[PDB]
Amino acid sequence: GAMGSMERASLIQKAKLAEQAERYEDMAAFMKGAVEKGEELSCEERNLLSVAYKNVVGGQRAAWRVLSSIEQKSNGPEVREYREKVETELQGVCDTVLGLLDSHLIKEAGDAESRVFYLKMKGDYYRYLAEVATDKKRIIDSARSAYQEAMDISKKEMPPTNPIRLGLALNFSVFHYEIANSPEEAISLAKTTFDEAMADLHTLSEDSYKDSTLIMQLLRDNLTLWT
């Protein structure tokens, strides 16, 4: 692609600069370029990839919800047309991320930390497709499958306070609540995740304790909304 002539290290440096500049579309394109070099990503590089596309799709999701709400209240073709424009661009970003994961991040990821990270992302970007889907069932089952494989590996291979495991459970629980229409499964997962992490905090350093409790607080926030 357009980044094929730039060094991998330069793409990573510029992704970090684009983050500082809040230039997340640039950040995402630089990290896409880095992935397409074909080498595995480090922990820091995986986080750069995720932060970039989360910011990009986050703006599109927020736009889509504004337009969808206007559209629903309005029910001329303009509101529908422009909602469809934004929806199509959002689906394109999701398709791009899923393509990176499938070609070939997931298959080359052998360590639990990398494989769970990528399978969580796969679940997330199928979930974002599900939010706009109206084939919705197949999309939902693809999110569930990715999340479920990530959970199984995380439960075998990672401590219950591991931040990737915690963020996976948080997002899978939200999937259950509002995509799968399984609010009891959502609440159950969030509770069990919070409680098993609480009982393992005593093993952690001050810095790891801060990392884990920050995501535990998100689980708590959702439980407060849900119960």
């Binding site: 986050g58 703006g59 999701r61 927020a62 849900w226």
Partner: peptide
């Protein structure tokens, strides 16, 4: 749309 907490940047 009430949005619940998910991992990483609350970008939406």
């Amino acid at each position: 749309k009430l949005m619940f907490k998910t991992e990483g940047p609350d970008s939406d």
